[PDB]
């Protein structure tokens, strides 16, 4: 059940495609998964692969609430290597009274895919304990989580969708990977109404954010009244760190205010030149966070740190001129079991929603872990809601830990 | 691609007969005059028979374009069955015709009296030749032939490895036999014949170089033989046997023996035993002999992984079940010579490896038993978190040795009353580098040692401490040393080992960091090293 023009699609090199090995899956996940895939080869949305096909892409499954299982595909590697329109990111979306987000996903099943490119969408289905070779599969529908599907979808339903935006221009509509973002300032009633209308439009209201309650975290530089030598060496290192990207900061006056007996327990009394220099740095750092400094031509980054136990702090920011765009916490939550990698995943998803609502894109996530600890916490975990964040592995550095706290 | 190797005159007398006996039945033909490629043909004499002609095909198995059989089925993942059959699909590639547009790269020259004339070139037409690259032609087509039978019969446990099918069931002998005949029928209807003489059906089973018994499996082929003039063929067979035994036993390395394999890929050429890759082969030799036996997984029982500890640079573990104490498999996690890991961290890494293996083989995660107090685990390496960690929720056992907390550092609130130190090193003029320390009390000294700037900056450390009290405050301008200290290692290499070795003696250290080269009180005077 699909006939509509095939948006033809090209690799950045037909020779260089995704060769990624499949994750280990539980008994339960293989059961649910082979059920899903077998059904979708009945309906024709998937088909068996060519015996000389060298590509693969990982698949996994999650327990969508109600226990009904769901198949997700990690298209991270393929997405980089293809990139062959749109409905653009509305500036007003981030200042709407409410913004409902809706999964489409299913409509993709009704849309064909370029069969000269589908060979690269291949994914292996494994069996428990390698009892047989994996059963390989290439795609026939628009695959969910694919990079070029929001385009091929939006251009395929262009003729029915853009009517509904030129009418009702009080709504700000956007689409990221497979989710549609409906933002409005109407009352809860008529908002629910129009979102219902648009749901039945793509039949051819689950999650709802209110991005005002999103604070700014308002970083602070604590200044003790009766300091010790060590409290001021921390103070010094921290401000020397700030001066690497903030102009007109100095640690000289307090540098020689720290002169005397050199036991870390020795006190100092506050001079006036150093106390004022300290104040200059303090108000220089509080006001540092500025989203208005975003540069759409540079890469966007989000860096995480474990600021003591049970709590991740992150900064979404940009490089060569280091400009912090916003900050954020994510505290381990009480009842459920949770390791630090899980708080990092949760944080990554919170960053994902914020960044999509404001910039319209996702940052690169810089996480202080190893490829082995991460990527083993995801293969068999709960807390995994979406395709995994694309991750850069960084070394823990004390200046950044002290900065984000 | 490759040049036909020298071949003993009494091998072609007996290999031309196999090649001629093969072009007669048609499995080969003559290549083309223009066929530029080649592959060597070797001849080994199987004990008490005729000469088995074995072709390499290792070179071209890379230019014959790629594909994508995701590991091995592990016999501990089989469960105990009242009835077991092992079908062998003989006629492996032997009659099954081969793609003619890939058929040219099949070329192999053959000697007459080793160049009494020019070489007789041949090309494999009918068979894929019993080569190694059956998994392409074999596994995914067999899998789709028998997958309907698999879905039809959930009461059976089927396992397809290269040319063995394994069928395990709890039906009676008669119903089981009938079903095995059902699948044999299905196989013949698609071309795959199962000869009655290679069937197993009987008390011990050969299966991927394992031996399956009712309660127990073990490594096939209970004796490793070390030849004193090792040709590379015999060596490769030794690496295969070792790799099979490596699924049951841990800690069996192939690396010095694979290093001992090198260029001159002739499988009747030889090597000479390097010293390390004889100790590997002898260690594996005694491990394999005096056999071990392991169990099958019991889905009706809790699964366990127990970490045991001896030596500070290795964590051993067993995946096993309880109340007969059935052991499913063993494994090791070794220390990293460069990294700043302590033993808690090696335990964590072992948990990662176990989680992977268990999920592949069993389909679930075991309960983790580790020898440590809840204190030395919840605090160490999950609450002193340089970098982050995915532990499970865990059962702590008390064993012969346990994992203890890393170090004696007291993080918050630098120690009241002990004298602060300051310390620095490096500043390479030329070869000359130095190291030194100063304290709030007058004490001070310079070392003026050899090394690099980094080793000079750690060698700076250990001299505040060798010359220090039992309590301390160290402050340094090195991000390297402060970083390692924040990972909390409990054993390292080199001079770092000695600094770790002085942290033995002391009761309370507090180390901290301040920016170097900003003229900070304390750092500045110790910078005077040049």
Author numbering:
A (entry chain B): 2 to 85, 91 to 210, 216 to 223, 237 to 429
B (entry chain A): 20 to 87, 90 to 551
Reproduce text from the manuscript describing this model.
RT is a heterodimeric protein of two subunits, p51 and p66, encoded by the p66 template and, therefore, identical in sequence except for lacking the C-terminal RNase-H domain in p51 as a result of proteolytic processing. The structure of p51 is rigid and provides structural support to the more flexible p66 subunit that undergoes functionally crucial conformational rearrangements. FIV closely parallels HIV-1 in its replication and pathogenicity however is resistant to all non-nucleoside inhibitors of HIV-1 RT.
To elucidate the mechanisms employed by fRT and promote our general understanding of NNRTI-resistance, we determined the 2.94 Å crystal structure of fRT. With 48% identity and 67% similarity, the fold of feline RT is conserved with the HIV-1 RT. The p51/p66 heterodimeric enzyme embraces the famous “right-hand” shape of p66, which superimposes on the “closed” form of unliganded HIV-1 RT (~ 2 Å RMSD). The fRT NNBP structure is conserved with HIV-1 with variances around the NNBP of fRT making no global change to the pocket size or shape. Intriguingly, a group of FIV variances clusters at the rim of the NNBP entryway. fRT is altered to K101Q, D192N, D177Q and V179D in the p66 subunit, and E28N, T139G, E138A, I135K and S134R, in the p51. Structural analysis suggests that variances at the fRT entryway could render a rigid pocket with a more of a “closed” conformation that could inhibit NNRTI binding. The bulkier side chain of S134Rp51 may further contribute to a tighter entryway by filling more space at the p51/p66 interface and interacting (3.6 Å) with the carbonyl oxygen of I180. fRT also forms three additional bonds around the entryway: one salt bridge (K173R/T39Ep51) and two hydrogen bonds (K166N/K49Rp51, and backbone amine of Q182 with carbonyl oxygen of E138Ap51). Consequently, the pocket entrance of FIV p66 is constricted by ~ 2 Å as compared to that of HIV-1. FIV variances, especially at the p51 loop (S134R, I135K, E138A and T139G), have also altered the electrostatic properties around the entryway from negative to positive charges, which may interfere with initial drug channeling into the entrance and subsequent penetration and binding.
